[PDB]
Amino acid sequence: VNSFSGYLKLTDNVYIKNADIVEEAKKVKPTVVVNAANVYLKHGGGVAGALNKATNNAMQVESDDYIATNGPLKVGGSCVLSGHNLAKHCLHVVGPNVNKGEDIQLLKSAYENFNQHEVLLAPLLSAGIFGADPIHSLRVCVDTVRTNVYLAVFDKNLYDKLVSSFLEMKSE
Numbered sequence: 170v171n172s173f174s175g176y177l178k179l180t181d182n183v184y185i186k187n188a189d190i191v192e193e194a195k196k197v198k199p200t201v202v203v204n205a206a207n208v209y210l211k212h213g214g215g216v217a218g219a220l221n222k223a224t225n226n227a228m229q230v231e232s233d234d235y236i237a238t239n240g241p242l243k244v245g246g247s248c249v250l251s252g253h254n255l256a257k258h259c260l261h262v263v264g265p266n267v268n269k270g271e272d273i274q275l276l277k278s279a280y281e282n283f284n285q286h287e288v289l290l291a292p293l294l295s296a297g298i299f300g301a302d303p304i305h306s307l308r309v310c311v312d313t314v315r316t317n318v319y320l321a322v323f324d325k326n327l328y329d330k331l332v333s334s335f336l337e338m339k340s341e
């Protein structure tokens with residue numbers, strides 16, 4: 170388990186790879202895979218839909234059960250559910266949907282959830298459907314997370330731009 174390979178080390182605890190998070194999860198067998206969720210755990214597009222499809226929809230049936238028992242999450246919050254065939258656990262984290270004007274400062278609260286886990290495979294929270302700048306999401310990740318985070322960025326052009334922007338920001 171946790172057989173991460175081919176990552177670029179950005180900090181002593183943050184690693185980044187140009188890869189699809191589902192294919193990584195099947196390669197790596199992580200203890201925790203992170204899902205970029207909404208508060209109802211309705212897995213639409215993005216990482217949530219990719220993860221859910223790879224579980225043959227088991228993720229969504231789990232999520233419906235969870236919500237029926239517990240109610241929706243709060244923005245910036247999380248819950249640990251099963252990782253099904255992809256990981257031991259899936260950490261569902263809700264970033265702010267800036268497209269809806271939710272507080273971007275909740276992106277820090279969202280990444281803080283990662284600090285409850287030794288090692289995790291994760292996407293860049295709020296950087297897709299939720300409209301945050303991916304460079305910002307990387308910045309908050311690096312500044313907030315102290316545990317070992319392996320970031321999967323599937324789009325090569327975004328990956329190249331994120332690395333370039335990280336170098337500029339680190340050197341100042």
Ligand SMILES: Nc1ncnc2c1ncn2[C@H]1C[C@H](O)[C@@H](COP(=O)(O)OP(=O)(O)OC[C@H]2O[C@H](O)[C@H](O)[C@@H]2O)O1
Nearest residue numbers: 189190205207213214215216217292295296297298299
């Ligand atoms: N297969 C893949 N492997 C690796 N990276 C991937 C990927 N697919 C997409 N990305 C990238 C794009 C983007 O850079 C980041 C997060 O994008 P995102 O998944 O849209 O998450 P958000 O927090 O912005 O929106 C949350 C809302 O959409 C969700 O469906 C959920 O239901 C909620 O309603 O990961």
